[PDB]
């Protein structure tokens, strides 16, 4: 019930690396997918108390759902992705070209509204295929590397029930109304004023805080470290700013 004013998952779960981690989808509209493989990893590391911690595979999720999770690289939705996770399991999959996990990610990185050493993103795109085998040499097989959830669900439009879900079980995922003043967000608590809407993509919430008085939600984006504040950005906590509180989902992993 009681809840601190500055709770941080990376802090209360220091033993869980995937939390601190930030990723890149590179020219895919994998809003949902990355936001999901992202919570289901810190959560797996948390539920087993860090006995197990793995990078769950964006790739896998992305390509092996089907019309039940949306249109691959053209959008998808968390409800089915998370219950897809509870209904069929996801495997291991670290960053692009990284040789980590049964299925490392297969869309190269790119640059999202930033100027920097990497190529400029191609604007949403082309679903990769779904091979149900791993990377040659990755030892435990696809059937053997699957990680299943025990159950999948939404939290209510209240903040208290969202803030509380992160406290007991780990960083959660959500979507929000996108605005162009949001691209270009660097620091401080974002708030919409001058922008056109541009879509609703998914993200990963992992705490909250009060800053300078303006209250806010600590989030991880899938646009990479040079974007935002290192990949991360605070947003307005309390008014359902930009629908950020309207759609929150999370599942508990399978004990064992």
């Amino acid at each position: 019930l009681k809840l601190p004013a500055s709770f941080d998952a990376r802090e209360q779960w220091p033993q869980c690396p995937t939390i601190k981690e930030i990723r890149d989808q590179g020219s895919c509209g994998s809003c949902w997918a990355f936001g999901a493989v992202e919570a289901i990893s810190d959560r797996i590391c948390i539920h087993t108390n860090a006995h197990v911690s793995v990078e769950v595979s964006a790739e896998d999720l992305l390509t092996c759902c089907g019309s039940m999770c949306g249109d691959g690289c053209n959008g998808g939705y968390p409800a089915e992705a998370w219950n897809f996770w509870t209904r069929k399991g996801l495997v291991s999959g670290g960053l692009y070209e990284s040789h980590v996990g049964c299925r490392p990610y297969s869309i190269p990185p790119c640059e999202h509204h930033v100027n920097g050493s990497r190529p400029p993103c191609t604007g949403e795109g082309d679903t990769p295929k779904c091979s149900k085998i791993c990377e040659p040499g990755y030892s435990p097989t696809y059937k053997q590397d699957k990680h299943y959830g025990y159950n999948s669900y939404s939290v209510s439009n209240s903040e208290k029930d969202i803030m509380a879900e992160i406290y007991k079980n780990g960083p959660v995922e959500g979507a929000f109304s996108v605005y162009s003043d949001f691209l270009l967000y660097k620091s401080g608590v974002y708030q919409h004023v001058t922008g056109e809407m541009m879509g609703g993509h998914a993200i990963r919430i992992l705490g909250w805080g009060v800053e300078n008085g303006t209250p806010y939600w600590l989030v991880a984006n899938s646009w990479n470290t040079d974007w935002g504040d290192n990949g991360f950005f605070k947003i307005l906590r309390g008014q359902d700013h930009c629908g950020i509180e309207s759609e929150v989902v999370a599942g508990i992993p399978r004990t064992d």
Partner: protein, 163 residues
Amino acid sequence: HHGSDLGKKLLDAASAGQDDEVRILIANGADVNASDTYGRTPLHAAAWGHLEIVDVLLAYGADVNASDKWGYTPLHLAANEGHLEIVEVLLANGADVNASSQRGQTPLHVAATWGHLEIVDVLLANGADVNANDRQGKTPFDLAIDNGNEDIAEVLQKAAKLN
């Protein structure tokens, strides 16, 4: 507030496939034909592995051919998943066999590139159109071959063959 709420309540039951809470919510009158962001209905959710919920949802008048952000209808998803029984019930309640999407994807297109004879066959026996064109320039046959299912690649050509 029960609009959006009951609607969500049914959406969660159908998605969790909680038949009894399905049974109640609709009888009391949850929308059934409710729609969240994205464009998903319960019948879309229930077209996973829940046949009574798919039955009851149609019997209270759920649009049997709602489409989403994407363009899929419950019949699409079912084809993808499999669930021969659900899809027979979808067709019989008036599913479009050629319900198309922003890609030009029909239940026949999805069913051979996710590997399932049984279902592609029913779609076929039920007026599935073979020749059609997914914009990527891929008929179910390319898809059939393209991915990994030569069986289905056969049945699709003999039918078009007599074409």
